[PDB]
Symmetry: D2
């Protein structure tokens, strides 16, 4: 432990700590959750501070040697080398000013090790305020999370579902509506439905990016840009785009809206929440399809991933659909916290940013990781019980309707009843009731009862 002195007081910080006094005071002020910023927010703070130093150097406001040291330090933070140097609670001052100062202090300590003296506020925070920085970092992280990680994971899941839909194009089975027997579908058609939900999910995320990517940087304390260069925003954004390749980043359409509100995070959480709703449907159908082996639906077999029960030997459970539906619940909860924070800004500043940031970035992370796992450890290895599915379809009261024009709906209903009673196919029941004659050939019967043709699947 080393000793430091702010105005006014003495504070002890850990010897290995690169943060300084203001960060240590915040550590002492907010012992609330014990959880600090995630890797992605820390990275984005590093990206922002490097770009700001670049621009301050470019405009002749910051000595090049100082700028170069900030840029080098900030690069180390952005590269994830100092994730342990950010100890401040998520539940901190609502502008995120404490984490902003944490970044400035850590950068100055890194630079000191290379022989360059940096003032955390006067140099590392030059042209910035305690209010346009943390939300800028939040939107960088969220935009990067969307574009570089979530959309590719969703595409991977989409592609897995679509491949199954193709494999199972002719795997006929009974539809279910209201959980009751219905006319035939194919397993491929159902999975093409799941694939569309994920594809629409990607479209939903893409549609929020024009506003998610808006950055407040340059608006300084109240959105007016006082004490910054007039073009600071567009210059900093240009550097960030050039360096990251994230072309979705842009200066805000209105500098006051970009600090008074965090509506872009609320909008984006809505898209994540819709994806959670879709994933809930997909995962719950899939675990119901896999239910059994003997007292359930037994339509498909999920890959085994681990023993199911500490007490019931040999049982295996749909653990990936469970992870997906729990993740979806968490995204829904996080979404409510985000909206609550978003609605409650006042005048020139929304002061729920650290909480909103935690929730939106966690939702991105959970959906990204569980989507890849779902695709790779569950969807890819599904196998269908093809004969079981076809037998139930061919035995269903739902398929007697195309018999009506041959034998009348009365006799069709009798066929339906006897088929259930004897657990027979409709076909065999028609034969056993002696209905094959000049009225109905066996070839006409097989045409009328072609359950795959009833599913009306496009041939390829």
């Amino acid at each position: 432990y080393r000793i430091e002195h702010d105005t006014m007081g003495e504070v002890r910080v850990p010897a290995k700590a690169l943060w300084r006094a203001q960060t240590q005071r915040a550590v002492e002020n907010f012992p609330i959750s014990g959880r600090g910023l995630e890797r992605t927010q820390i990275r984005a703070l590093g990206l922002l501070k490097g770009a700001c130093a670049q621009v301050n150097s470019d405009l002749g406001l910051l000595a090049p040697e100082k700028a170069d040291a900030i840029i080098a330090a900030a690069a180390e933070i952005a590269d994830g080398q100092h994730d342990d140097q950010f100890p401040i609670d998520v539940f901190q001052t609502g502008s995120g000013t404490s984490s902003n100062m944490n970044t400035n202090e850590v950068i100055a300590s890194i630079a000191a090790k290379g022989g360059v003296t940096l003032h955390p506020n006067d140099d590392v925070n030059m042209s910035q305020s305690s209010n346009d920085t943390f939300p800028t970092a939040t939107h960088i992280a969220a935009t990067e999370a969307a574009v570089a990680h979530l959309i590719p994971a969703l595409q991977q899941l989409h592609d897995a579902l679509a491949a199954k839909a193709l494999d199972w194009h002719t795997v006929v089975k009974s539809g279910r509506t209201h959980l009751m027997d219905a006319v035939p579908v194919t397993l491929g058609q159902e999975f093409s439905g799941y694939a569309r939900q994920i594809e629409a999910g990607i479209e939903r995320v893409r549609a929020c990016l024009p506003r998610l990517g808006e950055l407040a940087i340059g608006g300084t304390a109240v959105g007016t840009g006082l004490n910054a260069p007039d073009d600071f925003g567009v210059r900093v954004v240009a550097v960030l785009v050039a360096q990251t390749g994230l072309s979705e980043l842009r200066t805000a359409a209105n500098s006051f809206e970009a600090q008074a509100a965090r509506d872009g995070l609320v909008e984006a959480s809505g898209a994540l929440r819709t994806i959670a709703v879709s994933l809930t449907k997909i995962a719950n159908d899939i675990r119901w399809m896999g239910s059994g082996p003997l007292t359930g639906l037994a339509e498909i077999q999920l890959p085994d991933l681990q023993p199911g029960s500490s007490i019931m030997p040999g049982k295996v459970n749909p653990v990936l659909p469970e992870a997906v539906t729990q993740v979806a619940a968490q995204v829904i909860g996080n979404d409510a916290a985000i909206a609550w924070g978003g609605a409650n800004g006042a005048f020139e500043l929304n002061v729920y940013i650290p909480m909103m940031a935690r929730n939106i970035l966690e939702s991105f992370k959970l959906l990204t990781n569980v989507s890849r796992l779902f695709a790779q450890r569950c969807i890819a290895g599904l196998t269908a019980n093809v004969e079981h599915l076809r037998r139930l379809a061919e035995s269903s009261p739902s398929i007697v309707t195309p018999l009506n024009s041959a034998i009348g709906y009365e006799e069709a209903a009798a066929v339906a009843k006897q088929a259930l009673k004897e657990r027979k196919t409709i076909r065999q029941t028609v034969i056993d009731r002696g209905l094959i004659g000049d009225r109905l050939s066996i070839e006409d019967l097989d045409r009328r009862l072609d359950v795959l043709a009833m599913a009306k699947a496009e041939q390829l």
Copy 2:
């Protein structure tokens, strides 16, 4: 009372519905609230378009189809809103309300001498599962395009007009509710206007999927027992007759019946708009707070006496209506997502509940946005001189004095200005700082609070 038929069922004399509707009436006495006029309208539009297409394809006799088209137009025109008694909380496919529509059409046609079978004729090529969701998405799409977006535009334009009027009305900023550097009222209102403009963008961005219709998918999405092009033909007629260009056949017919994800998506946009409106309305009632113990920045138009007991008091009732509507939209949004997530296999069976909530959220936001615009925003007046005096008295504006008198003396100016409740300018003077290091002209340039707000400068015209 009349008797019908299984049977036997008693139905009110002047009722155009028949036995199945009356059964549903007896099965679901839950909320006492039925379909809204917009949903009834959409069912009418859909039934008329289906009859047109069945007629075109030679599946339905022209005189039967003509009778359906005439009856459906009456329903769509709002002539029979009292003929749909079934609870919202009905069978989750909306099949009861679908049959309600079929029965009412058949009764209307009967009065014209034409006999229609509610199922075989009016429900021809349709199922108990692709129709109610189609009508829901028609209603929601119309609500978005024909009503909500124009109402939001009206509010945007009213906010933007105030931003323009108040372009030079300088005041102190507030961050964390604490004194901050100068802004203008016009800047704040341009921020509010952007939030509403962004709200319109959000609604527009959900329309490609909100406008997707299930019609043609029949019982499970396969289109069994309908013509293969039933969907595209019905959509063609609907778009031609209504002008609702956003309507389209669904990209995937199973997704369009197994899920209502487009309603969940659209509710998110409405919910974000509710979040924006909460900010805007809160700020405005705080700006209007007082008259003497609050912020007193602006005056809201009086709309009614404030209090049954405190005489003369007037309250920010339009902001209250807006923030209460926003809470309702947030609650409706949670119900919609809950319904959306819980479909099974080929059918989501939460449609009537989801429909009730999404359409009510459209309606509330539409109506309160226009009232907010017209009865509050349009008539706001600013206490211009009060605002400016507070800005000119702020410790936050001494910074541009630093390069003239040093930051230590600037802090002393700040301290003294507060203690004496004087402006910074007057304090600088009262401390004898005006000499050859600082002329009065220089002082006024440095302490120009409007320039500190950095408002955009307009051109010479």
Copy 3:
């Protein structure tokens, strides 16, 4: 020209529909708030009428109001309470958040009624004597909610509990396979499952009763801000005594703290949490029941639900129940949102909170009785099918754990599935009948009804 008359308030003159019993302030509110198109419910109008009568009674008792005026208010308030004048309450739910407009609606309509019997009442000075909207509208709201809880919801839940409990008794020995993670588990009885459902509803009643000490708190007497200004010091205790006497609801009480009772609506938030928990319970019960009724061929086909429209019946009441639960969850979020956002001496989200909490009580009340009477009571069990499912679960190997150990039991279950044999046959075929396991042991242990430990 003869379509309207002129009324006035402190803001000026207002044209009012000629036949309307309301006056200037109601009419302003009609024009200010055309938002949802829906006004106060019957139950809300009743509680407002009841409250106004009770206030006039107490003002009469204390000699503050002339008995002739007091009697006219009490007479008119009773007409309002009984539902004679619901069409004279046109104001939207989404009005000023104190309910000022609906309070004046009641004052003005009472004044107009009393005018027809020859008595002149000032809507503020007489009908609203000793009162504010800020204590009377939350009081009317909590009266309605307390009444909904005690007189309607709890009895409806008890009816549902009793229907569930009767099935648990009737089906006490109907053995079936338990399911966990949706996969084949050890035996249970249908009766045991329904005893679980009954407990959830019983616990639901316990949750509603636990909120009553704060739901029943009334703000009446606090007037403008909670200080009681312009009311007798004992106005609250006296009005509540009249209320208790007239309604029979002993749960109504004066607030513990008069400032908390007006600055916040925390008791409505609290009560919504109990309703939301009940919606969560109902979702589980209804989902299980529609899955048990599923199929028959493609589903579990465990039970048959009564057919209501008009054998493969759609589970229409489970669908109504789970949709109602979704609504209660949505209403609950709206209520908490309004609840959190009070400022200083007043929470101004009351009409919206009232709309949602009263609707949640109504939906749960009505759907629970329907569910109990028209679904639960007439359920029939496919007893032989259920026993066959119980017998076929590979997890019936579980009671052999103490005899052959977890790992060998797992090997048994897997082979039985692979070779399509019973567990008993597989235990035999694996040569496990020996020193530490006999056929007698299996007859004892593999008995599926005994395994359910009923």
Copy 4:
């Protein structure tokens, strides 16, 4: 050499050489890398306590050899104490029964015992008489009950006491009431704080009211609630040991063993109380930051203690952000709670994460709020009295003498002419037989108008 082979009924698994977990835990490490966060200290504590108690009872009943039971009890005590938290690597977002974390505890106990020369089978011995399906929700409800009783209620009591202390200190500090954000009649700062204190007091009542069901434990129901493979009194014996060790008398066996496993309704109920407390805290914190606002542009009614380093209301901001998180967590909890199927609700680890977090946030921020914000507030007494006297609504007690409509005209003219209400009553010639100047000055005393009660 950096790994070893372990096995389960699904096959062989490579496990890090130094790890005390075994095959099923390692499978779960690979199956669920989702959030990157595992069980909390309190959850691992409760799991350790529970395994120890189970071994004690199995020993008592002669079902488990004493030296095996002793080894389990000793290992479980080390886990409970926190010596092995680094041995619990499994994600929160695992199988929804918590099977993986249950086997995590079983495997780590087996490895700890092996070091002392005792061989335990993770299933047959450490998991004897148990399922994940009764033990994981039992450990969850133990942890939740302990959080409520030993941590949250004392934290709320501390906040209540700090607020009540201000209500006393400021009992006669008169100010203007505000309703709809507009000028109302007088209140005292103390009266307002007595309202805040009651909200927190009611919050404690709300937490106390959920304990009879929060404290219900599924232990003994094993796989589905029937108690199969467990002694008929396993549950009650285990609960007695837990109550004795923890001192938590609120722990109890479940009223119905099927409800206790098929649903997690007690967590949903408890979250509702926490959500209500968040709603209260939001009102309290908002009022306090608005009272401290400005000073020039705001209300400037009170001064908040400066914490870093015009002081920003950072603790009210922490409180309102925590409340938002509690509301979010509460929605996640209800969602998981609703979606059980048949004999098991499979959202337990997610529901546990969220309810335990909500307890923790409310506990810690309530203590910080009490000590570092509420206790040091100072009132601007003269400014507050000036606000009270300036409100035009102070005309209200004249209603009985001049009627509502005239009093309204008085308030309107006072505002217009920038005069006091007293002068305006005079200017309008209202002093007469129905209102003397002595009555007027009696009725307009703002402290008296606040009607603060005798102490």
